[PDB]
Scaffold this active site. Sequence first.
Site, mmCIF file in Angstrom:
data_model
loop_
_atom_site.group_PDB
_atom_site.id
_atom_site.type_symbol
_atom_site.label_atom_id
_atom_site.label_comp_id
_atom_site.label_asym_id
_atom_site.label_seq_id
_atom_site.Cartn_x
_atom_site.Cartn_y
_atom_site.Cartn_z
ATOM 1 N N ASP A 125 92.089 37.234 16.770
ATOM 2 C CA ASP A 125 92.418 38.347 16.086
ATOM 3 C C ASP A 125 92.373 39.582 17.091
ATOM 4 O O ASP A 125 91.188 39.530 17.880
ATOM 5 C CB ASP A 125 91.815 38.643 14.944
ATOM 6 C CG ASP A 125 92.397 39.937 14.032
ATOM 7 O OD1 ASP A 125 92.368 40.101 12.883
ATOM 8 O OD2 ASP A 125 92.906 40.655 14.710
ATOM 9 N N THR B 36 97.945 44.048 14.975
ATOM 10 C CA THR B 36 97.239 44.552 15.928
ATOM 11 C C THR B 36 97.269 44.514 17.262
ATOM 12 O O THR B 36 97.353 45.310 18.148
ATOM 13 C CB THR B 36 95.744 44.429 15.505
ATOM 14 O OG1 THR B 36 95.472 42.940 15.479
ATOM 15 C CG2 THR B 36 95.288 44.834 14.222
ATOM 16 N N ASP C 233 93.970 37.895 6.025
ATOM 17 C CA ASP C 233 95.435 38.317 6.767
ATOM 18 C C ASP C 233 96.435 37.745 5.813
ATOM 19 O O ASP C 233 97.261 38.567 5.484
ATOM 20 C CB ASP C 233 95.496 37.737 8.116
ATOM 21 C CG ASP C 233 95.230 38.516 9.330
ATOM 22 O OD1 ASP C 233 94.912 39.588 8.948
ATOM 23 O OD2 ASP C 233 95.011 38.113 10.388
HETATM 24 N N1 LIG Z 1 106.685 29.512 14.359
HETATM 25 C C1 LIG Z 1 106.828 30.866 15.047
HETATM 26 N N2 LIG Z 1 107.844 31.001 15.967
HETATM 27 C C2 LIG Z 1 107.928 31.835 16.789
HETATM 28 N N3 LIG Z 1 107.368 33.095 16.860
HETATM 29 C C3 LIG Z 1 106.513 33.204 15.748
HETATM 30 C C4 LIG Z 1 105.908 31.889 14.801
HETATM 31 N N4 LIG Z 1 104.974 32.371 14.198
HETATM 32 C C5 LIG Z 1 104.822 33.767 14.597
HETATM 33 N N5 LIG Z 1 105.549 34.198 15.531
HETATM 34 C C6 LIG Z 1 105.719 35.386 16.054
HETATM 35 O O1 LIG Z 1 103.984 35.957 16.604
HETATM 36 C C7 LIG Z 1 104.264 37.167 16.440
HETATM 37 C C8 LIG Z 1 102.767 37.919 16.619
HETATM 38 O O2 LIG Z 1 101.857 37.176 15.462
HETATM 39 P P1 LIG Z 1 100.259 37.054 15.864
HETATM 40 O O3 LIG Z 1 100.194 36.461 17.061
HETATM 41 O O4 LIG Z 1 99.701 36.495 14.723
HETATM 42 O O5 LIG Z 1 99.608 38.686 16.007
HETATM 43 P P2 LIG Z 1 99.982 39.757 15.251
HETATM 44 O O6 LIG Z 1 100.637 39.375 13.906
HETATM 45 O O7 LIG Z 1 98.717 40.550 15.112
HETATM 46 O O8 LIG Z 1 101.091 40.542 15.961
HETATM 47 C C9 LIG Z 1 104.811 37.758 15.208
HETATM 48 O O9 LIG Z 1 105.796 38.916 15.514
HETATM 49 C C10 LIG Z 1 105.763 36.454 14.881
HETATM 50 O O10 LIG Z 1 107.303 36.803 14.976
HETATM 51 MG MG LIG Z 2 99.480 38.394 12.180
#
Ligand SMILES: Nc1ncnc2c1ncn2[C@@H]1O[C@H](COP(=O)(O)OP(=O)(O)O)[C@@H](O)[C@H]1O
Ligand SMILES: [Mg+2]
Lengths: 50, 149, 389, 170, 523, 526, 99
Positions: F58, F91, F392
């Site tokens: 995170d 974040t 989350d």
């Molecule tokens: N299966 C997936 N395929 C493509 N993009 C994804 C998938 N799961 C999550 N994401 C993308 O990852 C991005 C960032 O999420 P994350 O890495 O959890 O950090 P945060 O949510 O804090 O930005 C999101 O904007 C989402 O669109």
């Molecule tokens: Mg997230």
Amino acid sequence: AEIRVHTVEDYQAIVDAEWNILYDKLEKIHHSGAKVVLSKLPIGDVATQY
Amino acid sequence: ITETKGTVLIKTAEELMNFSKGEENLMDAQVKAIADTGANVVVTGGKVADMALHYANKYNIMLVRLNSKWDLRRLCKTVGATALPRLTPPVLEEMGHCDSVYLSEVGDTQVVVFKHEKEDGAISTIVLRGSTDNLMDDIERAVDDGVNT
Amino acid sequence: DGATILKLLEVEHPAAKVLCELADLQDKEVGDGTTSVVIIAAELLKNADELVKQKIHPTSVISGYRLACKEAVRYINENLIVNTDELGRDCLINAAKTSMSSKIIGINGDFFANMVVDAVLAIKYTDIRGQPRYPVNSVNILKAHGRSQMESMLISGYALNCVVGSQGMPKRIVNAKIACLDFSLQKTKMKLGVQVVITDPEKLDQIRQRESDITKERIQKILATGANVILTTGGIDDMCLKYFVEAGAMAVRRVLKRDLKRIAKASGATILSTLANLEGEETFEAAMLGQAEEVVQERICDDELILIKNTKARTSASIILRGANDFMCDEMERSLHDALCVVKRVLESKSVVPGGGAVEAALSIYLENYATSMGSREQLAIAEFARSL
Amino acid sequence: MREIVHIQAGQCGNQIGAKFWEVISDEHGIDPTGTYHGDSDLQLDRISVYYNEATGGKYVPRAILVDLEPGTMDSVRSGPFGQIFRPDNFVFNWAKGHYTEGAELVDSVLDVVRKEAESCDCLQGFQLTHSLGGGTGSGMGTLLISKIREEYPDRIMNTFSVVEEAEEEA
Amino acid sequence: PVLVLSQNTKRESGRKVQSGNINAAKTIADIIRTCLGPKSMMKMLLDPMGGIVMTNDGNAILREIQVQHPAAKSMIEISRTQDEEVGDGTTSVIILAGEMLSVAEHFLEQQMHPTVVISAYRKALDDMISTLKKISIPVDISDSDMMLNIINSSITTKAISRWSSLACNIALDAVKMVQFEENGRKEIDIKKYARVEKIPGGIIEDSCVLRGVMINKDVTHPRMRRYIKNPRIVLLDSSLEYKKGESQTDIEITREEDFTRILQMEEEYIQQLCEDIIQLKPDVVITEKGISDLAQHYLMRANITAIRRVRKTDNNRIARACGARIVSRPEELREDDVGTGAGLLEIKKIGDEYFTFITDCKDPKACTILLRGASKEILSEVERNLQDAMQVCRNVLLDPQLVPGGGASEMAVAHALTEKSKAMTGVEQWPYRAVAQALEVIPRTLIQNCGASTIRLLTSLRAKHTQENCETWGVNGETGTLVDMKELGIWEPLAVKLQTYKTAVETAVLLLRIDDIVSGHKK
Amino acid sequence: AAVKTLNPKAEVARAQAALAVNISAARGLQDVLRTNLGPKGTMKMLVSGAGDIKLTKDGNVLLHEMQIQHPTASLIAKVATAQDDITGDGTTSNVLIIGELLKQADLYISEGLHPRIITEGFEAAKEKALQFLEEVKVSREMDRETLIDVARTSLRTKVHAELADVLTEAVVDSILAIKKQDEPIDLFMIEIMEMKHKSETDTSLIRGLVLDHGARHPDMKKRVEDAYILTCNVSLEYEKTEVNSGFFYKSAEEREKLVKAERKFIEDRVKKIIELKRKVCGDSDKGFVVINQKGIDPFSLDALSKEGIVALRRAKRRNMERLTLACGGVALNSFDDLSPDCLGHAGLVYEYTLGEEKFTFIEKCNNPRSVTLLIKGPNKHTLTQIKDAVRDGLRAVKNAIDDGCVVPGAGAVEVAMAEALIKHKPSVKGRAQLGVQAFADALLIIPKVLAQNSGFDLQETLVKIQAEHSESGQLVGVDLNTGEPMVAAEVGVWDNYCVKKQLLHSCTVIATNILLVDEIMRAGMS
Amino acid sequence: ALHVPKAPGFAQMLKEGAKHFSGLEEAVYRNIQACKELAQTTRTAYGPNGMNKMVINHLEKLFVTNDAATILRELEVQHPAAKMIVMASHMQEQEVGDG
Ligand SMILES: Nc1ncnc2c1ncn2[C@@H]1O[C@H](COP(=O)(O)OP(=O)(O)O)[C@@H](O)[C@H]1O
Ligand SMILES: [Mg+2]
Ligand SMILES: Nc1ncnc2c1ncn2[C@@H]1O[C@H](COP(=O)(O)OP(=O)(O)O)[C@@H](O)[C@H]1O
Ligand SMILES: Nc1ncnc2c1ncn2[C@@H]1O[C@H](COP(=O)(O)OP(=O)(O)O)[C@@H](O)[C@H]1O
Ligand SMILES: Nc1ncnc2c1ncn2[C@@H]1O[C@H](COP(=O)(O)OP(=O)(O)O)[C@@H](O)[C@H]1O
Ligand SMILES: [Mg+2]
Ligand SMILES: [Mg+2]
Ligand SMILES: [Mg+2]
């Protein structure tokens, strides 16, 4: 303990009561016939002279 | 005694001459009331008084004091009794039964034994004899592993 | 200010500490001219030391100095000017202006001199009538930075550096009845000697109630006579502020004792340290109440203070000084004290004397001429005194 | 009976509390490893007012340790007699946002003191040892005394705070 | 052995002292002169405690700096005196004082006694004030558009300039609702009844001003209602619990029943207090002290909602908003102390925290401004800007006069003094003209910050002001041209200008009178 | 410098140095935080001074546990904290976009421009982006399948798929179970508990309550099959009078009488409870459980246990509301008005033991409005990681319910805003077009970082993504296992609307405020 | 000679005394080494023919045993990977008691 009293006669009686208690214990020891006395606790000068 | 602060207040001489006699008589009455039910041994978890010990010896009562707050519970489980939070003569359901209670000596150690003939009981004890504390600890660990298995 | 400077400095030489205490004594005795006396004394020492370096015994110098001082003091009573001969107001104004010259308030001399003369005249006291008295330092001087100094104001009344007790109280009283007290208005508490022992539990509630009821009874006694303003040196409890809040009256706490004395004497009230009378019971009589024409709470540069206006028993005055900052305000107060003292001295003794060195020049000439008629070794000492003047 | 629990706050407060617990342990029959050697019964009469006995005969103090630093509690643990404290009786940047800083720390402290007061039978009070004029004792100690009082507004809270010409007619 | 007279005291005197004082004043002026006008840039400050202050306010800049030279201390003090007196203009005063003191060493070095300079300054100040009063304009306080224009011209320099329409409305509503007249005729606009609450998060456009108050508190017991439509509120200054007296009392009991009877009398007392409160039939109880569990039980049995341990200032604001008054002894509770001016009581959650709103008041005299935004630094800067705007509005309400901005007033006063100086004879003429020509530093700094040709623009503006009816011509700060202030719409209160000029001139007068410095005398 | 002549010990950085320092700090932060984004990000291990271990992914935890002493880092960390505590997600993207914005701004500032032009461009671009986002969103009915998709998307980025599939159902079920169709969702009604055994695939949801303490008397029953529940916060310990009191007796008999008489106040309450229990549970078929927020004496414990009562003491305050909501009773502070209508019902009560710890389960409630999430695992760091992931997921589902709309993800929205802004920028007058271009290029960071983490070529992948979405008006995002363009809505990748809105606002505000700093100064007391 | 000053960014903003390891060469290959050495430490106490081991703790107390859990408890480990392996072993001991 604590003693609360109002009159001098009761004061004198209270003073006499302690001597009466100690002498009662001493006479109870004496009348049993024992000639030697042993204790784990202090023996006072009054008891020694008695 | 009271939980709140207490004080013996006297205004005459008869009360002063009678207080200790009354206290001693009350303690004697309580101890004899306990002894009348047929109890042979009294186990306590706290302090004992000189007058209480004197009367217990007078009435032929065996007095054992053990103090862990857990050994007391284990002994209660072993014998079948219930700990009483006030000093009162027990009822039969609260009274425990053990066959043998005695004092023995093993290898420069004084021990008190509560022993049954029953093959089941409630708990059991293993007495280890060794020439070194480290060896005895290792054997204890082996016994623990066996029990876990 | 010479006295302030010499008091703030730390000195190790006793010969210098003598001059320091000389300046302090001059400030206590008169209040003006604490810088001239130090210069005169140092010059006298310097001039006498040369004669001592010549084979002249110090006793002759001392006798000559004593004789010269006596003659100078006697002669100064010829250069006098009687203030009654001059017109009084401009005489006083000129004396005040001359005193305030060379300070931070020099250019505003006329403005501040008018203020000072008005305050001094308003604070005049009626004595046995053998001599009237002018007790300066009875005027309260307050400092508060903000607007320009020409907005400093004279208050015909009194000013308190205090605020109202609670925010629920009114903050302006038109016709004010004033009660001055010298005791606390908190809930009662038995003295050290007395103690409470309870054996019947039913009797605790009434004792606990009486503890709070005694003070309420006192407050009702005070308020029954129509008092609008209550001034107290002691504290006032939260439980006791509510009675004033509901009655619609102002309560001020932690008032200084000197301020209370001045307010009481100005408004005609009587200071009370207890409500007891010449009998057992306690009473408050409408006879011992002060009267004022207005009591307001006013805001000054983010803080608040209290104005009491037009006291009827006597007249009282206060001054509020405005400046750029704290240093300027303090210097203004120090410069104003000198003017007040000078005006007081002039009014008490109706005689004035020219300034600028005329007195010193005349004394030097006269003593130089007079030194001959002695024809001795004191002539040198007298001439040295004249030259050091 | 009459159990009393202890709170330690700050660096100097933690050190003072550690010293007090050390000296009381040497006075009793307690040793650094949590077992008992004392020969006098009077050393064991009131042991439950300051100690909890675990299954197996070991004793643990009734103390809570708090500081806003990851080094003070570690220093106490490294120092002698620091291992006898229960490992979960510790509470541990200075200022985040949140509109209120320390709200989670005070909640953790309240939870731990609740869990500690659960074990005792008839507790009576809290002994708080903290700096008084310090920042942790005034500001970061966000009225912790007030919070404790609100939590338990019936028990005592004993705190060891570190220390004129006008004179005419009338 | 060592013969001394004044132990380790450091003395300095002569022209060195005057030069040092003037240099220190000029340095203090030079630190800040980049923060004037709509093209000002921010400064971030690191405080001893570990925070950060990203700001543009002159007083905020200057109060976070530690200095050793006493002249610097004097300037720092006059900054906060201006800030307390009027709340706006804490940079122009410093710049003006720096220039007024810098234009004096020219005459000091030409063997002119400082008293003549002091007299000339004190003579020029009066003629400055007279001209400022001459060129004033009246304003109608009932013209909301004019008031919004004034506030917008005041805040067009800070960071809230992107949300000026929101900021002006917030400030105007707050000031108007706080305005109050009461017993007698004491009109006041005290701003301790206009609270500001910063809650990080959301978006800045969600900032608002409430008809009521908001507190960070929650109900004591979960079974109390959290939403009341038309509540009747009672406020208390006492604790609803049994407490010991103070007369050193003891109880001596020798019977069985006394202990239980004593334990029961406390519950009886609590019940009596609760019933006495209930007799008035309220809906909300607010108190600054504790509330006991049995009292909570009785109040809930009577369907009341209670709040514990509110601050005294918040209690005062609630009282002023809902019309109730605080009562310490419930026995003396009447129908007058119950406030019925509320219109909704609600308890909501804003990010894992509970908040209590008392809103929809009929006529509140206290208000809460609620700010949302990115983080604490941004919210703090917004708070400072809002304070500036509110104090400007209060000054306008307490004195309805306006003068043109952008340097027009400075140039008009300079021209008036220059015209008046030619009727004077003597040595004072030169300082008299020097101050008037020293008033041009404000338009010069505005031109410099805009980024244009000062040498050409300043003389063009002087020539324009040399005409007859051109007292309102000034500099446009966004482009760098000359424009009539009537069409542009930049006006400022007269009190701010008067305070600025008076403070600057008096500071120069104070600093021109020093001759020597003594240091190290240990109280 | 002017400041140095007054305070020789001060520190200062002037016009260009301040900008250089700020840009360098922002780039340094983003260089480390860029490896967390996406489900393919790596895990960081953090070791404190005490020797503890924390595995994390995170952004907020990394920011507040990485060792840094920079003012700009402090500002960015505060902004991330506000983002976290308001929305619960996004974040890392905050820091990424802030860093990219500052870098792109400096790229043009290095050629002699002034920051104010870029600031105006930023404002115009933000307005256009908000307008576009307001229309790109998708409004749905928010049914169970949609919530499952949203929760799985939010949880898959923290733990592996096997555990994410377990956590998604539990989170969605809890949120749905504590929900009424009004009165916006109130957390603190879901309890998070952790028990250290039985590997994490056993994490579950309990339609009841779990308490971390159990019965204290040995003879109390260990299991109840049909229980009345009483909830109270009255004190059953010995109490002393507020005013000072003391007993004054004369003889031992009087002392005994006083000792007996000093307990009637508490024995009365115990008798009241016993009488109510005997009135309600006549025969020995049901059970009686008491929960108290205050202490209980051993005498009271024995008295209650003699009649078959299961008593728990010193529960937490929030459990007073939770038990009421779940079982359906009344929490009461006095026994004066005790009646059966104040009791609740629970279908099962039992006890579990873990070495030195004890737990109590209240289960089989009729229509519970409060539930519990029981976390399990063999490591403290595992439990902490799962707790953060659960936070989350709960926040994501609650935000999705509170809003009426959800948004496609995987960079499609960023691509769409970049394309829209590029066509918008010719309408602007002056040099603000450069600011608009910089804003678009900054917005294009998320798909680049996702492709880089998945292991493809940034330029080629972004060129393909922009090649689509222009010949077909579909919303196109990145496929993380093939690199090809895809349609997010059909695959099932969703994001929150409020998160994007807050992120845009905060990033723009912070970048604009940072770009205008003229100097950095430390001239106060040390 | 000259010095390699530092790298801009995180390498400059890092606190004094902190450590930052990254990559396969600086993290994974060192964690594997630590775990391998820890396993080799207690390899020799396995089976019926295992040899006893003598450990003295920080309080000068003497342990003689061939039980892996006791040995790991009495040793003090500074490496996080070995710490996680130790916690795995302790969890196994708590769950079953042998192995
Ligand atoms: N299966 C997936 N395929 C493509 N993009 C994804 C998938 N799961 C999550 N994401 C993308 O990852 C991005 C960032 O999420 P994350 O890495 O959890 O950090 P945060 O949510 O804090 O930005 C999101 O904007 C989402 O669109
Ligand atoms: Mg997230
Ligand atoms: N207008 C004036 N013209 C000439 N001398 C003046 C004038 N005003 C004051 N003085 C002189 O100033 C001296 C006072 O010095 P100052 O420091 O002001 O006060 P002091 O030393 O008495 O405290 C006196 O000798 C007085 O004659
Ligand atoms: N739009 C504008 N055009 C020209 N001058 C302006 C404009 N807005 C404000 N000013 C001028 O900027 C001056 C200083 O204001 P500011 O920079 O906010 O600091 P302060 O208000 O503390 O003096 C004011 O005298 C005003 O005349
Ligand atoms: N008599 C035996 N012959 C061969 N192997 C044995 C014998 N007894 C035990 N073992 C083996 O010893 C192994 C490990 O046991 P041990 O050394 O106690 O360590 P642990 O049981 O803790 O792994 C077991 O896998 C078991 O198969
Ligand atoms: Mg004088
Ligand atoms: Mg301004
Ligand atoms: Mg084995």
